[PDB]
Design a protein around this ligand. Sequence first.
Ligand SMILES: O=S([O-])[O-]
Length: 236
Amino acid sequence: GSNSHITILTLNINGLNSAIKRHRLASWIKSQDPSVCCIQETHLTCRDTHRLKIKGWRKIYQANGKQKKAGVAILVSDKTDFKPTKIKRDKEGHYIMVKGSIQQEELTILNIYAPNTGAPRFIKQVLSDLQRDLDSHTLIMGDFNTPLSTLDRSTRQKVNKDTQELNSALHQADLIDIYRTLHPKSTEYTFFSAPHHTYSKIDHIVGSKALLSKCKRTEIITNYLSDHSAIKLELR
Ligand SMILES: O=S([O-])[O-]
């Protein structure tokens, strides 16, 4: 039935330098119809950001480096009135935060692409740097390049000390893994590693514990676009 929920989607797209990949992405976004879309690994340089244009999604905020490497973007649908108050872009293109409100209701979105190496330490550092901005209306999403619990890997291997430290930091900031909270017994994955034939959930949606009761539904979406599956959160 008709309602005022928003949907926030996160996808690591694995590059957007070829025109067709941009149209395939535009088609997929059009079909998913997210209020807000967090994309990682655009691989667009700070010179080439204007290449990313998606009909229906005219408001776009990007953080990019100088190389065809990393690159993150937050796209807001034309049907969504997100009045921003603050946009903080990583100079190296690994995260972007936008803060603002929809419907008089405040919302802080942090889109992160952690490096393959040192990911859990990287994410903890970003949280600390942004501590004053990450309030009780926060969603953090993206490709953390790490599991957060044992169920996030097919190996069932315990998570390392740096990941344990990351989880402590999340808890100190009143943040929780929304997907794992809604689906505690889930053994779904977003990424397949062919070298070891293993599967992992390295893409996450984390948020303020205060937003828990607003989190209606969250799901993983397989796709032909990328080597990562998307995740979608429906928020009251
Ligand atoms: O598109 S506006 O939010 O700068």
